[PDB]
């Protein structure tokens, strides 16, 4: 019938839009994990540096 056409113009948009917004809610969240990981990768190198420098200084000093 004619009401069955109407349910199909909607039922198409409301999956196109909600599939799109579940891949932005994916995407932001993927970059959020890859940032936190990298802000701790730079933190890891820094600490190392400070320890290699530190020990050399105490060897020289002594």
């Amino acid at each position: 019938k004619l009401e069955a056409i109407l349910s199909q113009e909607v039922e198409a948009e409301i999956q196109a839009l909600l599939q799109e917004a579940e891949a932005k809610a994916e995407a932001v969240k993927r970059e959020a994990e890859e940032k936190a990981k990298a802000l701790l990768q730079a933190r890891e190198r820094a600490l190392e540096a400070q320890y290699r420098a530190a020990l050399r200084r105490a060897e020289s000093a002594g």
Binding site: A53, R56, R57, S60, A61
Partner: protein, 114 residues
């Protein structure tokens, strides 16, 4: 007669040298500097990033102690301290010999000291 061609290169921490000229042991390489130009800045970079290759050349010389010698021939108030504080960056002040000549020091010792 007592020398022979060297061939063991070092990391100066400046790309440009270690490609184009290749700074090896027993070789000079003046760094020409103008007047109204820095001289101090650039020098410091070569002192804290001077290091042999571990086997990147096919060998090292890290197996024998690497050390540095200094001797300044006329220096002011800033160049005095500027050098000393980058030698603590270097971590070398227990294995270096410094022959600092100032400008408040006699002018005759500017050619003796070398």
């Amino acid at each position: 007669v007592a020398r022979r061609k060297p061939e063991q290169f070092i990391q100066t921490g400046i790309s440009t040298i270690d490609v184009m000229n290749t700074l090896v042991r027993g070789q000079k390489l003046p760094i020409f500097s103008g007047s109204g130009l820095p001289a101090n800045e650039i020098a410091a970079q070569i002192a804290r990033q001077a290091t042999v290759r571990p086997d990147l050349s096919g060998e090292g010389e890290k197996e024998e102690p690497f050390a540095v010698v200094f001797a300044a021939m006329g220096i002011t108030q800033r160049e005095l301290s500027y050098f000393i504080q980058e030698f603590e960056r270097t971590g070398a002040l227990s294995r270096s010999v410094l022959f600092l000549n100032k400008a408040d020091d006699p002018t005759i010792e500017r050619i003796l000291t070398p």
